[PDB]
C-alpha cells in the first residue's frame, strides 16, 4: 500500500488510509455507551487498567456543568480536544453570556479535526468522543469521529465490541427515549447496554464510570462506590 503514508494522499478508490487507521485506534479502545432521553443524557464507560496494580484510566471528562464527553482511543488527543471544547464554551460564555449549543460545539470539533486530514505534517486525532449536554434545545448526544464526522444520536456506542451495545440500544430505543422523569432508570438502561459489549469481564465499582446531565442535573461523574447502586 503506497497510499497510506500520509493524510494528503487519496488512494485510487478515494480512501484516506491514515484516517481509517486512526479509526482503528478507536476500535481498539474500550467501550463507551451514550444514550439520552428528552430530559437527560447519560454516558457509561468501561475503564481499563494496565494491570492489577494500576489505576483505571479516566474515560469521562467534564467540559461544563452543561456539557461533557467520554473518550475511546488515544487519550492525549481527547485531552487536546476537551481543552479546545472548554475554550469554545468559555468564549461563548464570556463574549455572549450564552451557553454554547452542543451541536455547534460538535461542528467546531469537526472543523478542528478536518484540518489534520487535509494538510501535510499533522496527523488525524486517534480518538472517538461521545459528547452529552443539555441546552435550550434539551438533551443532546453527539458521536465524534476523527474523520471529522459528527452525528447527533439518541444512543450509540464506540470502542471494542460496541456493536453489541449499539444493537441493544437499537432494540430498546422506543423505551429509553421516554425515560424523562427518572435518571437512574436511564443509567440502568445504559449499564444494561454496555453489558452486551463485555467479554469475559464484569462491571465493578473500579472499572465502571457513569456521567449524567440534564434539565436540572449539572454534568456529574459517578465512580467508585457511587456506581455500586447501578451494578
Amino acid at each position: 500500500n503506497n497510499y497510506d503514508g500520509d493524510t494528503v494522499t487519496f488512494s485510487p478508490t478515494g480512501r484516506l488510509f491514515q484516517v481509517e487507521y486512526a479509526l482503528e485506534a478507536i476500535k481498539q479502545g474500550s467501550v463507551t455507551v451514550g444514550l439520552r432521553s428528552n430530559t437527560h443524557a447519560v454516558l457509561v464507560a468501561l475503564k481499563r487498567n494496565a494491570d492489577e496494580l494500576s489505576s483505571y484510566q479516566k474515560k469521562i471528562i467534564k467540559c461544563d456543568e452543561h456539557m461533557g464527553l467520554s473518550l475511546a482511543g488515544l487519550a492525549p488527543d481527547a485531552r487536546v480536544l476537551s481543552n479546545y471544547l472548554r475554550q469554545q464554551c468559555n468564549y461563548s460564555s464570556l463574549v455572549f453570556n450564552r451557553k454554547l449549543a452542543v451541536e455547534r460545539a460538535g461542528h467546531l470539533l469537526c472543523d478542528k479535526a478536518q484540518k489534520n486530514t487535509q494538510s501535510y505534517g499533522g496527523r488525524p486525532y486517534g480518538v472517538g468522543l461521545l459528547i452529552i449536554g443539555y441546552d435550550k434545545s434539551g438533551a443532546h448526544l453527539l458521536e465524534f469521529q476523527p474523520s471529522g464526522n459528527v452525528t447527533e444520536l439518541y444512543g450509540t456506542a464506540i470502542g471494542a465490541r460496541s456493536q453489541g451495545a449499539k444493537t441493544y440500544l437499537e432494540r430498546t430505543l422506543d423505551t429509553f427515549i421516554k425515560i424523562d422523569g427518572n435518571p437512574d432508570e436511564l443509567i440502568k438502561a445504559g449499564v444494561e447496554a454496555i453489558s452486551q459489549s463485555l467479554r469475559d469481564e464484569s462491571l465493578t465499582v473500579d472499572n465502571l464510570s457513569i456521567a449524567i446531565v440534564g434539565k436540572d442535573t449539572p454534568f456529574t461523574i459517578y465512580d467508585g462506590e457511587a456506581v455500586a447502586k447501578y451494578i
Binding site: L94, V95, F96, N97, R98, A101, E103, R104, H107, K136, S137
Partner: protein
C-alpha cells in the same frame, strides 16, 4: 479619537410588559444640524432594539456588526428563529466586549449604547454601555443630555423596580414623548423628529418612525421683554 457627526440622547424605560426606547433622527456636525434622517434605533430581530448615541460612523459600524452577528447566528442553527435566536443579553454582552476591547486598544467606538429588549422568558432587558465599557442597568436609562433631564421625568414614573408592574405602556409612552419634548425645548442638538420603539412580551416589537414633538408651549414668550428694565 474625536467625534465628528453625532446623534445625541437615547432614552428608554421599562414598563410592566416590555421596554420603550426613543431617539431623535438628527446627525449634528458641531453646531450645524447637518443630517436630519439618521435612524439611531437598530432593531435586532423581533425582541431587541439597540439605541446608539454619539459618533454616527461608529454607529454605522455597530449596525454592520449586528447584522453580521444575526447572519452568523443563523449558520448551522435550525433553531435560529426559535430557542437559539439571539437574546438581548447576548447582543449586549457582545457589544460591551467590543467596546471595552476597543477602549483598551485606545481606539474607542465613541458611542453610548442602550440595548432594550425582552428575553425569551419575558424578562425586560435594559442595559447601557459606553465607549469606556462601563455598563449598568436601571428601570430607566438615558444617554447624554437625556441623562440629566429625561431620567428625572421617567423616574417620577418608575422610581424602583416595584413600580414596573404598576406602569402601563400608555403611561410609559406618554412619559417618553413628554421627555422628548423637554429635550427639544432644552437640547440645542435635538430634533423635533424622533423614532420610538416598543418591545412587548405579548405584542412584540412596534417600531414607530417619523414621530414629531407636538403640543409645544411658546405663547408666553410674547410677554417676555428685554433682559431686566426694558418695558
Amino acid at each position: 479619537q474625536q467625534p465628528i457627526v453625532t446623534g445625541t440622547s437615547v432614552i428608554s424605560m421599562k414598563y410592566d410588559n416590555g421596554v420603550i426606547i426613543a431617539a431623535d433622527n438628527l446627525g449634528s456636525y458641531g453646531s450645524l444640524l447637518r443630517f436630519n434622517g439618521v435612524e439611531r434605533l437598530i432593531p435586532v430581530g423581533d425582541n431587541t432594539v439597540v439605541g446608539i448615541s454619539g459618533d454616527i460612523s461608529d454607529m454605522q459600524h455597530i449596525e454592520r456588526l449586528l447584522k453580521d452577528l444575526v447572519t452568523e447566528n443563523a449558520y448551522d442553527n435550525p433553531l435560529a428563529d426559535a430557542e437559539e435566536a439571539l437574546e438581548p443579553s447576548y447582543i449586549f454582552e457582545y457589544l460591551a466586549t467590543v467596546m471595552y476591547q476597543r477602549r483598551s486598544k485606545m481606539n474607542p467606538l465613541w458611542n453610548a449604547i442602550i440595548v432594550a429588549g425582552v428575553q425569551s422568558n419575558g424578562d425586560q432587558f435594559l442595559r447601557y454601555v459606553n465607549l469606556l465599557g462601563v455598563t449598568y442597568s436601571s428601570p430607566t436609562l438615558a444617554t447624554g443630555f437625556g441623562a440629566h433631564m429625561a431620567n428625572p421625568l421617567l423616574r417620577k414614573v418608575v422610581d424602583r423596580e416595584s413600580d414596573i408592574p404598576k406602569t402601563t405602556v400608555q403611561v410609559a409612552e406618554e412619559a417618553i414623548v413628554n421627555a422628548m419634548r423637554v429635550l427639544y425645548y432644552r437640547d440645542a442638538r435635538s430634533s423635533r423628529n424622533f423614532s420610538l420603539a416598543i418591545i412587548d412580551k405579548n405584542t412584540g416589537l412596534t417600531f414607530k418612525k417619523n414621530l414629531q414633538v407636538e403640543n409645544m408651549k411658546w405663547d408666553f414668550a410674547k410677554d417676555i421683554k428685554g433682559y431686566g428694565t426694558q418695558k
